[PDB]
Enzyme design. Sequence first.
Site, mmCIF file in Angstrom:
data_model
loop_
_atom_site.group_PDB
_atom_site.id
_atom_site.type_symbol
_atom_site.label_atom_id
_atom_site.label_comp_id
_atom_site.label_asym_id
_atom_site.label_seq_id
_atom_site.Cartn_x
_atom_site.Cartn_y
_atom_site.Cartn_z
ATOM 1 N N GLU A 103 -7.093 14.890 -0.171
ATOM 2 C CA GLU A 103 -5.682 14.574 -0.054
ATOM 3 C C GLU A 103 -5.093 15.219 1.187
ATOM 4 O O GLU A 103 -5.285 16.402 1.427
ATOM 5 C CB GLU A 103 -4.922 15.037 -1.295
ATOM 6 C CG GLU A 103 -3.406 15.213 -1.112
ATOM 7 C CD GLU A 103 -2.698 15.661 -2.399
ATOM 8 O OE1 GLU A 103 -3.361 15.728 -3.458
ATOM 9 O OE2 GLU A 103 -1.481 15.952 -2.356
ATOM 10 N N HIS A 110 -6.563 19.150 1.333
ATOM 11 C CA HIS A 110 -7.393 19.684 0.266
ATOM 12 C C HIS A 110 -8.270 18.688 -0.480
ATOM 13 O O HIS A 110 -8.092 17.487 -0.390
ATOM 14 C CB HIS A 110 -6.571 20.556 -0.704
ATOM 15 C CG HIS A 110 -5.368 19.887 -1.268
ATOM 16 N ND1 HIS A 110 -4.152 20.527 -1.364
ATOM 17 C CD2 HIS A 110 -5.195 18.660 -1.808
ATOM 18 C CE1 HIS A 110 -3.269 19.703 -1.901
ATOM 19 N NE2 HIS A 110 -3.878 18.565 -2.189
ATOM 20 N N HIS A 112 -9.694 18.117 -4.525
ATOM 21 C CA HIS A 112 -9.823 18.503 -5.922
ATOM 22 C C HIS A 112 -11.222 18.116 -6.346
ATOM 23 O O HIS A 112 -11.709 17.023 -5.984
ATOM 24 C CB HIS A 112 -8.816 17.775 -6.793
ATOM 25 C CG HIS A 112 -7.404 18.193 -6.558
ATOM 26 N ND1 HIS A 112 -6.765 19.127 -7.354
ATOM 27 C CD2 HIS A 112 -6.510 17.818 -5.610
ATOM 28 C CE1 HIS A 112 -5.533 19.296 -6.911
ATOM 29 N NE2 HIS A 112 -5.355 18.518 -5.854
ATOM 30 N N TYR A 206 -3.336 12.791 -13.306
ATOM 31 C CA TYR A 206 -2.876 13.543 -12.151
ATOM 32 C C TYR A 206 -3.509 13.050 -10.844
ATOM 33 O O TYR A 206 -2.820 12.924 -9.854
ATOM 34 C CB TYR A 206 -3.033 15.085 -12.304
ATOM 35 C CG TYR A 206 -2.677 15.757 -10.992
ATOM 36 C CD1 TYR A 206 -1.336 15.990 -10.645
ATOM 37 C CD2 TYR A 206 -3.667 16.085 -10.055
ATOM 38 C CE1 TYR A 206 -0.996 16.543 -9.411
ATOM 39 C CE2 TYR A 206 -3.335 16.639 -8.820
ATOM 40 C CZ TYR A 206 -1.993 16.859 -8.504
ATOM 41 O OH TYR A 206 -1.652 17.405 -7.283
#
Length: 266
Positions: A103, A110, A112, A206
Amino acid sequence: PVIRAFSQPAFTYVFKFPYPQWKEKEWLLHALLAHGTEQSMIQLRNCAPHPDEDIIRDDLLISLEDRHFGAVLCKAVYMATTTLMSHKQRNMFPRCDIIVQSELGEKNLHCHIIVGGEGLSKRNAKSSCAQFYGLILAEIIQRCKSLLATRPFEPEEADIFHTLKKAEREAWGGVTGGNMQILQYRDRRGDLHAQTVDPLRFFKNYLLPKNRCISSYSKPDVCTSPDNWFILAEKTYSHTLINGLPLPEHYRKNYHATLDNEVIPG
């Protein structure tokens, strides 16, 4: 092929690319991570957002599809995660589930990582941060060197490269600088937990409902096709890997819909 199962125990990490000037100087990353795309990235700046017709835009995006720097970063992290589980299981072909999503954040570049399987536990997941960080850096650094087949580093490019190598050295000494963190939560009583109880729901709720943006110098309404636009989404993603396979931009919203309706409602 919607994912229906995720190996437990599962944990979620956030990797921060350790270069603060990355938005201001993003073309350096284009070259270091995605050599061959640097011109495409520039042309992309001049593209009209949907729903305007723009054929140049459409092809440009098709040609960039698994090759833009965010996508590469994302593959790097995935490979590193594979290597990580490989070590934890002392097995060259580890049994695990892995999702990675890169992202371009407001502040940070970053990834995830949701990872689950034998060899991880509450006992070792947090402490594995530095090791994980170092493995990630090793992959990125190696990718940086591919540029060297075409030309030597420009000075600023070399600055980033040595920043990575220093970070990598520090990782071997258990320092991450905050650039590798495990996500933790509290239960009612106020106890900490590092285990991601519901990896699919965390993915679905999310990570999935974001619009795409592949450059700081581009816009989500350029990079996201209309059928995949999440009307209330305020954050973006660059690239998403599910167990090694990319979730292609044009299936994202439908992929989410299938998870939300048939597989794991709520």
